[PDB]
């Protein structure tokens, strides 16, 4: 019964911002000491009681998410924090209880060119509801004229990507993100991390 976080940051095909991935961490336990304290991370925004004590408490259930984000775009990585992400890609749960273990991998998850490994959202009916995703590639209908499902004036393909490459500056540099909803449910509560 050993489930390392390896499998998550080893997901070298890190999912796109909107098209994040999941792993229902349940009925498993593993020790995450070195990569949580001795980690080379940056902007360890992990909420909860603290960055620690999670490797000391059992978990009700744990859910994993991966984001591939522009460098300082982290500003928008918070529920109720507005921006061109919450409006379009992932407005975090208004009362987000899980946490964030994001950090810059300029080498990892980016290579020279217009990297095709990540995509995000630009145009929507309205602000995306918290804690969900959009798969749609339907065009951006908002207003008077119809557009018969082709891109054009006031109807654009809503998923444009900043396919950056490692050469950028920190704000435009690559940034891995992972979001870990340590959610809390009833009698089935089968995760621990000592």
């Amino acid at each position, epitope marked *: 019964n050993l489930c390392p976080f390896g499998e998550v940051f080893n997901a070298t095909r890190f999912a796109s911002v909107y098209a994040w991935n999941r792993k229902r961490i349940s009925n498993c336990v593993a020790d995450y000491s070195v990569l949580y304290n001795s980690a080379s991370f940056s902007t360890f925004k992990c909420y909860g009681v603290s960055p620690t004590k999670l490797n000391d408490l059992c978990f009700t259930n744990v859910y994993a998410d991966s984001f591939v984000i522009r460098g300082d775009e982290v500003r928008q990585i918070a529920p109720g924090q507005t921006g*061109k992400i919450a409006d379009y890609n992932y407005k975090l749960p208004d009362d987000f209880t899980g946490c964030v273990i994001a950090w810059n991998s300029n080498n990892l998850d980016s290579k020279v060119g217009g990297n095709y490994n990540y995509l995000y959202r630009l145009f929507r009916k309205s602000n995306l509801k918290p804690f969900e995703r959009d798969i749609s590639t339907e065009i951006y209908q908002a207003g008077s004229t119809p557009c018969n499902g082709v891109e*054009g004036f*006031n109807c654009y393909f809503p998923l444009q990507s900043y396919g950056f490459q490692p050469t950028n500056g920190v704000g435009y540099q690559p940034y891995r993100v992972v979001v870990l909803s340590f959610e809390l449910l009833h009698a089935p509560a089968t995760v621990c991390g000592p």
Partner: antibody, heavy 120, light 108 residues
Framework: QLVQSGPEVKKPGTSVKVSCKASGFTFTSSAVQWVRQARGQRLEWIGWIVVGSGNTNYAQKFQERVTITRDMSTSTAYMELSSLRSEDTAVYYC????????????????WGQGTMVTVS | EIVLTQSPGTLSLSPGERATLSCRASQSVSSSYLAWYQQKPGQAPRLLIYGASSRATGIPDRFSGSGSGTDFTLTISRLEPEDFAVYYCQQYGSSPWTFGQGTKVEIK
């Protein structure tokens, strides 16, 4: 309304940027197009760029001979071109549909004073 | 696509205008995404009609147009003979958005 930047006098050979400023209507709810004219000329197109995206469009006349840019902080729009020609003198009109955050019109109605873009 | 057409060239008229202006192309293209604009001696090219049968919240009454698809038309049924400017057609639709030949209106 709209206020284009000042009448900009650049060299007949140069690389030129141009700036436009809004009023009421917000770029990040619409797109902005660039077109050219002079005193009597056919009102000729350049291109247009979404504001949400960097997606810009233009004839085969501008594949490498064009560059547009936006400002989500100042909400000032810009174009530029590198290694233009003396023929490229014109009153560079930028226009954009009246849009206020899902309150949009479908018409390139709003045409500023016009930067006299003068390659001289 | 590029070769648009506007038959009336430089129409010549006088006060008491029931004039009209029509737009064709070298190609059959969309209908919901084409417009006519008004340009005076030294003014910003103002908006007249976006789409054949259409108007804005402020564009003047007695102002209209029709047609679709293949061919387009406009008119201003009555008018105070104040200003007689150039009128510009422009499809945008699908790329590349482009502008028309431009037809003038004057007074004898």
């Amino acid at each position: 309304q709209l206020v284009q930047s000042g009448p900009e006098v650049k060299k007949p050979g140069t690389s030129v940027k141009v700036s436009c400023k809004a009023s009421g209507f917000t770029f990040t709810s619409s797109a902005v197009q660039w077109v050219r004219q002079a005193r009597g000329q056919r009102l000729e197109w350049i291109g247009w760029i979404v504001v949400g995206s960097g997606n810009t469009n233009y004839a085969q006349k501008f594949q490498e001979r064009v560059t547009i840019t936006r400002d989500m902080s100042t909400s000032t729009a810009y174009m530029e071109l590198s290694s233009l020609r003396s023929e490229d003198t014109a009153v560079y009109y930028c226009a954009a549909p009246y849009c206020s955050s899902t309150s949009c019109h479908d018409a390139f109605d709003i045409w500023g004073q016009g930067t006299m873009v003068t390659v001289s | 696509e590029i070769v648009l057409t506007q038959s009336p060239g430089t129409l010549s008229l006088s006060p008491g205008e029931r004039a009209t202006l029509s737009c064709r192309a070298s190609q059959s293209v969309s209908s919901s995404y084409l417009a006519w604009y008004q340009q005076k001696p030294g003014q910003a090219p103002r908006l007249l009609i976006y789409g054949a049968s259409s108007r804005a919240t402020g564009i003047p009454d007695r102002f209209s147009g029709s047609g679709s698809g293949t061919d387009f038309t406009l008119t201003i049924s009555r008018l105070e003979p104040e200003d007689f400017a150039v009128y510009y057609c422009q499809q945008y639709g699908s790329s590349p958005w482009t502008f028309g030949q431009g037809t003038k209106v004057e007074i004898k």
